[PDB]
């Protein structure tokens, strides 16, 4: 069905980065009409500004110099009901370091009922030049290697001990 996956925070200068704001309904059989708004506040600024608006399968970027022709839609497509408000950056820079807001507005249609709700998703992005490996993977790899090494050491120690044991037993008998 749907899964709510938080985005990543390691955009690398000169490369591409996908910001995924996934907001999904509590019941998937429902009919909705969803649109979204993204606002961005740099590391060195106070107020959030609006950067793009996506409604009815048309993307509208604001007159913004830090995103002019550098962000394209990479969310749900072909539908008026959106459960994936992702966007794509085709050339990451250092002005793309800051905090993003993903405002998603949902209008659910039930029997003689029209509910208007809202969600907000906060995404923090720090831009680097070399993607540093994460502590989880580094520690896991080191631990797997040390565990293999210690297991092998224990096994070989026991083999040599048993060889000496059985040689002594055979010589005794």
């Amino acid at each position: 069905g749907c899964v709510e996956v938080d985005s990543e925070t390691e955009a690398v200068y000169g490369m591409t980065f996908k910001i995924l704001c996934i907001s999904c309904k509590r019941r998937s059989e429902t009919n909705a009409e969803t649109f979204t708004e993204w606002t961005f506040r740099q590391k060195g600024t106070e107020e959030f500004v609006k950067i793009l608006r996506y409604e009815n399968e048309v993307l509208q970027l604001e007159e913004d110099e830090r995103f002019e022709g550098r962000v394209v839609w990479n969310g749900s497509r072909g539908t008026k009901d959106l459960q994936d408000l992702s966007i794509f950056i085709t050339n990451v820079t250092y002005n793309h370091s800051g905090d993003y807001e993903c405002h998603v507005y949902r209008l659910l249609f039930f029997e003689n009922y029209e509910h208007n709700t809202s969600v907000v998703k906060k995404i923090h992005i720090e831009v680097v030049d070399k993607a540093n490996r994460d502590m989880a993977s580094i520690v896991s790899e080191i631990m797997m290697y040390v565990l293999i090494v210690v297991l092998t050491i224990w096994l070989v120690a026991e083999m040599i001990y048993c060889y000496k044991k059985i040689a002594a037993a055979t010589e005794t008998a």
């Binding site: 069905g1 749907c2 996956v5 996934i22 749900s76 003689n112 709700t117 896991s140 026991e158 083999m159």
Partner: protein, 1282 residues
């Protein structure tokens, strides 16, 4: 030998009797009135029949009576007292009446009358002319009761009309008929109901049914302790369910807006209609009840604009609930019988939470498994005793008869034959017979090849092939009629059977779609050489033969129930029909007609009663429907079970006796096999002859080390721990693994250590034993195979190619990892070994069942070849009326103008033999069978729009299949299991470690009587022993616990605070009294309390009671927690659980339990392994199919918990078609191959039909087998215990 009972004879007999009475044994069954004529005098002179004769009995000689004859064995004793006091026994009126009563034409007259009346009550709205028939019917019933009274008397004395209990019914019906003839009282339906009692006159007149009914009544009366124990257990579990769930099914989702500032209470006073409810609450599309809710996070959720409330009516018309003790008992009975229990399971889980599936697991294990099983095992012992006594007495009677015969013997002391000779041996040699058998098999394979989308060259090929086959068979019959004796050709049942088949085939040729199925009957000719098809033939023949009276009784019972249901509620279904149908027309299942009433009765017998009961209670009141349905179950199920058990025992023992050798007559197949073997051997020897004519202790010093390395408990424990870890790591690969980066990485690296460790273990074993030992062991082969799969996956991933399809499937095969656990666990391995040895035993019966199901599948294919196609409005799924789109051409023409139209076809249908096999599996399991019946009975033709009930009488096809391939085949399976148990010279589910404490615990039940406590004489203390020593304090305590049970039942949902306080204080008083008894028992049984298990149970019960009340009032005042409060206020039931004491009908049950738990635990371990593997593979594959049918937002394969919930649900086969239906989608417009799933890249939203079918057929087969052995273990343990 017998005087005519003259005037002087009667006078002298009366004088002697009177003299003996003034001066002031048992009857013999051999000639009791109504049995037969004793052979003491053999025949009787023909010059005297039906005349009052001297009573042929010394015991009744001292009484006043006489005897009559009817030209037959039957003899009836008539009272010599005057009929009504104005009719002497010598009066010609009485003599003529006796003659008529004894004549057999009289009995045949009654038979004709009552059977015609039975055919007449089948009518639903009889016309005017039936009143004349009814009048003549009541007249004919008169002149028979009158004859009976004129022969014996009304109430004169003994041997009068009314002394035999079965004549009360006739008088009752006579007076009822002639009372309602003129007097106007009561409603029509109630009056018309009572004429069904005239059907019991069938039991009265037809011989044998009297004895059968008497035996059934005696058996029911014998069955009392099991019934009361079952009621008590259902009551205890109903109390548990009522406490845990109470108003939980009243949860719904109410709007958050409630415009016009209307409060919830202000809204739920003007809401009456479903569409009005639909505006304020949340209904799923097409559902009739509002969607259920939940407060915990594990329970169900509902949309954004809807909050959760506890107001409304319960689901299923308000009949499915736990609010009231009675409704909770109804639900617990339904869950006992497993009838539609999947809906209750899902509703309860959604309302309360998935954590409460433990309740369902426990109850399905305790009631739906154990109590039903022991009901069966207690009714089976009645048979094993009654039949033993009957055979013993029959043997004694036969021995006495033989002795009497010996005593009596001692007291006595050319034209055409010359040319017919050739055919005499040309049509009876093995070659022709084996050729005929091969032709039969080829014809079967040829006819199991038709299919719906058949091409015309194929169709005519089939036609000509069947023509050739029927010509061959007609020729082979004419070569036995014109070439052999026409009069000797009819002395063999196989000859008559073949003649019948060939005439039917000729009729079809030189002529419907049903005549072509009578060729399928020929496959029974192989029964003459296959000694399991012969066993099935014997089973069916015994059903219609020796045990035919039981079948007749069952038929009468079903007919009576159908008629009673029709009469009671047939007009209710017609008037009050908009209560149960939105279209305001009759539902599929109703009782307006006799056929439909009989279908409902058949459904209830099969085990599907609650769905129809809801509509019954909606249309025709609650009490009436409840009594009718409950009586139907209790009687019909008992009679069907009696038939099953009697037929099984007869076919097992009375039929199989090895009286003759294995085919004492030289079998043609055996002769042909011998000739073939000899010819092959000779040819091979000649060919071989012609061909020959033409032409350093180091290696040991390390191998011993490694061998001893893989022996230690340390190594074994380490590897088992690694197996557990590697298996458990698979449960985490949910659809949510993407949002758990750390755990994903740790697992992606842990699999590598696991692979390395297992490869090292494999190499160590290789060097430990060596190829000879390693590759000759199946467990080692399995482990090596799993290691190979893992190694291939690792190599592929390390070298890339991770997107390759075959490699992805091989990765999916990682779900077999847990199977490595099925070598190191002793219970698992022992159970697997015990299970493997039974496959060859049942292979033959499995093949016979496959053959029978193939015959049924071919018949079904011929009947419904591609006739389930329908024009469907996809918006709402409404089949278009046949008046608008009569066929495929018009449906397609409508596709051009409209948008949402489809010439849809059922996924499980009868298009070919495989799909027919699947449909028959669904029908035999009663899961999804109803859609198939509806589509079948709506059949019209190929490329024709189905019409409602156009082929209504195709229900008989399914009825016949259920009676034959689901009842008799199961009987055969059980029969071939029982004899397997018998062939052995001498438990095989237990391990060696469990054997020792099994033997140790054996003595626990067989314990010597406990030493009585000494009498202490001490001041006050002595009187307290005198108080608690006698059977008055104990009985008062028992009735106190009963009263406590009643005050626990009194609770309901919505009761007032006054009731709450009253019950709380009554329970406080009960706790005070129960503590008082315990303290008194302690101070009177110093140092002997705690020396009897029941006293320790009482002490712990008292303590848990006080503690439960204290924590209950503490949680209420502070730390509000409804769920934990409910759980704590559940130790009150300890008091009622203490009631099992003092009843030697529950303690033995519990001891049988505690005897069987070891084997049950081992089998459950194996079943959990299988369920774990299947759950993992389900997460792997079916985690992205469309959410439809039985797969929804709460019961899916998207997580380990959901997968295990579904697998537990279908372990019993409950709703296994609902989960399979979504998976059968392969291609659009019922699919979306390019479907985007946010948060993942698994594009595609439907599964592989082949993998789904194998999954859901294999799993149910394994579950059925495992439960069969689970039943066997407890049955054997009960056999030993009793």
């Amino acid at each position: 030998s017998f005087v005519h009972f003259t005037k002087q004879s009667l006078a002298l007999i009366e004088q002697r009797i009177a003299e003996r009475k003034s001066k002031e044994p048992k009857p013999s069954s051999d000639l009791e009135a109504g049995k037969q004529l004793p052979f003491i005098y053999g025949d009787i002179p023909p010059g005297m029949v039906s005349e009052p004769l001297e009573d042929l009995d010394p015991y009744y000689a001292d009484k006043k009576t006489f005897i009559v004859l009817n030209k037959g064995k039957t003899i009836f004793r008539f009272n010599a007292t005057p009929a009504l006091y104005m009719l002497s026994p010598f009066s010609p009126l009485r003599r003529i009446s006796i003659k008529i009563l004894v004549h057999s034409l009289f009995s045949m007259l009654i038979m004709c009358t009552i059977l015609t009346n039975c055919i007449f009550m089948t009518m639903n709205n009889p016309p005017d002319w039936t009143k004349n028939v009814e009048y003549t019917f009541t007249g004919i019933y008169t002149f028979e009761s009158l004859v009976k009274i004129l022969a014996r008397g009304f109430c004169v004395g003994e041997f009068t009309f009314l002394r035999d209990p079965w004549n009360w019914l006739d008088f009752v019906v006579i007076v009822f008929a002639y009372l309602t003839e003129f007097v106007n009282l009561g409603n029509v339906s109630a009056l018309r109901t009572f004429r069904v009692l005239r059907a019991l006159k069938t039991i009265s007149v037809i011989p044998g049914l009297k004895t059968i009914v008497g035996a059934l009544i005696q058996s029911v009366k014998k069955l009392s302790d099991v019934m009361i124990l079952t009621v008590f257990c259902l009551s205890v579990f109903a109390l548990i369910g009522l406490q845990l769930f109470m108003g939980n099914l009243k949860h719904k989702c109410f709007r958050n807006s409630l415009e016009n500032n209307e409060t919830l209470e202000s809204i739920m006073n003007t809401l009456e209609s479903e569409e009005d409810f639909r505006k304020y609450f949340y209904y799923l599309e097409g559902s009739k009840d509002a969607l259920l809710c939940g407060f915990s996070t594990d329970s169900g959720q509902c949309p954004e604009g809807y909050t959760c409330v506890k107001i409304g009516r319960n689901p299923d018309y308000g009949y499915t609930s736990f609010d009231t003790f009675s409704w909770a008992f109804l639900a617990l009975f339904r869950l006992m019988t497993q009838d539609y229990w999947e809906n209750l399971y899902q509703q309860t889980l959604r309302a309360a939470g998935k954590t409460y599936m433990i309740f369902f697991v426990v109850v399905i294990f305790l009631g739906s498994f154990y109590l039903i099983n022991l009901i069966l095992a207690v009714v089976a012992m009645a048979y094993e005793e009654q039949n033993q006594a009957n055979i013993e007495e029959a043997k004694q009677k036969e021995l006495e008869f033989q002795q009497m015969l010996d005593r009596l013997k001692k007291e006595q002391e050319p034209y055409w034959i010359k040319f017919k000779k050739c055919i005499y041996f040309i049509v009876m040699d093995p070659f022709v017979d084996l050729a005929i058998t091969i032709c039969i098999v080829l014809n079967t394979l040829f006819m199991a090849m038709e299919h719906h989308p058949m091409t015309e060259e194929f169709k005519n090929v089939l036609a000509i092939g069947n023509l050739v086959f029927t010509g061959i068979f007609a020729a082979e019959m004419v070569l036995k009629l014109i070439a052999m004796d026409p009069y000797e050709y009819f002395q063999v049942g196989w000859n008559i059977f073949d003649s019948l088949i060939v005439t039917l085939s000729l009729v079809e040729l030189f002529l419907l779609s049903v005549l072509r199925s009578f060729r399928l009957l020929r496959v029974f000719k192989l029964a003459k050489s296959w000694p399991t098809l012969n066993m099935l033939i014997k089973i069916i023949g015994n059903s219609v033969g020796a045990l035919g009276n039981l079948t007749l009784v069952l038929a009468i019972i079903v007919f009576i129930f159908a008629v009673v249901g029709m009469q009671l509620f047939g007009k209710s279904y017609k008037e009050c029909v908009c209560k149960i149908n939105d279209d305001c027309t009759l539902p599929r299942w109703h009782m307006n007609d006799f056929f439909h009433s009989f279908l409902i009765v058949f459904r209830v017998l099969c085990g599907e009663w609650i769905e129809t009961m809801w509509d019954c209670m909606e249309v025709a009141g609650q009490a009436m429907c409840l009594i009718v349905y409950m009586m139907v179950m209790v009687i019909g199920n008992l009679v069907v079970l009696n038939l099953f058990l009697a037929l099984l025992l007869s076919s097992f023992s009375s039929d199989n006796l090895t009286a003759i050798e294995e085919d004492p007559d030289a079998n043609n197949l055996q002769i042909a096999v011998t000739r073939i073997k000899k010819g092959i051997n000779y040819v091979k020897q000649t060919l071989r002859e012609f061909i020959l004519k033409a032409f350093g202790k180091i290696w040991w010093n390390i191998r011993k080390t490694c061998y001893k390395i893989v022996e230690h408990s340390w190594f074994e424990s380490f590897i088992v721990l690694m197996i557990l870890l590697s298996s458990g790591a698979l449960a985490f690969e949910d659809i949510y693994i993407e949002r758990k980066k750390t755990i994903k990485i740790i697992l992606e690296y842990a699999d590598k250590i696991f692979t390395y460790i297992f490869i090292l273990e494999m190499l160590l074993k290789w060097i430990a034993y060596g190829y000879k030992t390693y590759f000759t062991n199946a467990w080692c082969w399995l482990d090596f195979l799993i290691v190979d799969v893992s190694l291939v996956t690792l190599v592929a991933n390390t070298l890339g190619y991770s997107d390759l399809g075959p490699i992805k499937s091989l990765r999916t095969l990682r779900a077999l990892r847990p199977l490595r656990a099925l070598s190191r666990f002793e219970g698992m391995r022992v159970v697997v070994n015990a299970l493997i040895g039974a496959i060859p035993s049942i292979m033959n019966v499995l093949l016979v069942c496959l053959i029978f199901w193939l015959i049924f599948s071919i018949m079904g294919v011929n009947l419904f070849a591609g006739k389930f196609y329908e024009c469907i409005n996809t918006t709402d799924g409404s089949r278009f009326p046949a008046s608008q789109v009569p066929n495929r051409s018009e449906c397609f023409a409508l596709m051009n103008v409209s948008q949402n139209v489809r010439w849809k076809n059922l996924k499980v249908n009868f298009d070919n033999v495989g799909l027919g096999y699947l449909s028959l599996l669904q029908v035999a399991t009663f899961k999804g069978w109803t859609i198939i019946m509806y589509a079948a009975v709506d059949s019209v033709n190929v490329d024709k729009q189905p019409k409602y009930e156009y082929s209504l009488y195709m229900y008989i096809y399914f009825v016949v299949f259920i009676i034959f391939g689901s009842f008799f085949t199961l009987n055969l399976f059980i029969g071939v299991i029982i004899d397997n148990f018998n062939q052995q010279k001498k438990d095989i589910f237990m391990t060696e470690e469990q054997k020792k404490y099994y033997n140790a615990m054996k003595k626990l039940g067989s314990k010597k009587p406990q030493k009585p406590i000494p009498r202490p004489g001490n001041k006050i203390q002595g009187c307290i022993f005198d108080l608690v020593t006698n059977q008055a304090f104990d009985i008062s305590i028992m009735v106190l616990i009963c009263l406590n049970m009643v005050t626990m039942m009194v609770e309901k949902e919505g009761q007032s605070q006054h009731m709450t306080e009253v019950l709380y204080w009554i329970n406080v008083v009960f706790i005070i009294l129960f503590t008082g008894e315990c303290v008194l028992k302690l101070i009177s049984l110093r140092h002997y309390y705690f020396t009897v298990g029941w006293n320790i149970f009482d002490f712990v019960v008292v303590i848990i009671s006080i503690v439960g009340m204290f924590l209950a009032d503490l949680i209420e005042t502070y730390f509000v927690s409804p769920t934990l409060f409910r759980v704590i206020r559940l130790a009150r039931i300890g008091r009622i659980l203490r009631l099992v004491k003092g009843a030697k009908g529950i303690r033995t049950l519990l001891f049988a339990l505690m005897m069987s738990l070891p084997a049950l635990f081992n089998i459950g371990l194996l079943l959990f392994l299988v369920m774990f593997i299947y759950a993992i593979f389900g997460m792997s594959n079916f985690a992205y199919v469309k959410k439809e049918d039985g797969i929804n937002d709460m019961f899916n394969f998207e997580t380990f918990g959901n997968s295990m919930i579904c697998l537990f649900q279908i372990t019993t086969s409950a709703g296994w078609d609902g989960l399979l239906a979504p998976i059968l989608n392969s291609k659009p417009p019922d699919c979306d191959p390019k479907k985007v799933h946010p948060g993942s890249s698994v594009e595609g939203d439907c599964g592989n039909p082949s993998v789904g079918i194998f999954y859901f057929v294999s799993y149910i087969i394994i579950s059925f087998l495992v439960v069969v052995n689970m039943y066997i273990a407890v049955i054997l343990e009960n056999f030993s215990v009793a």
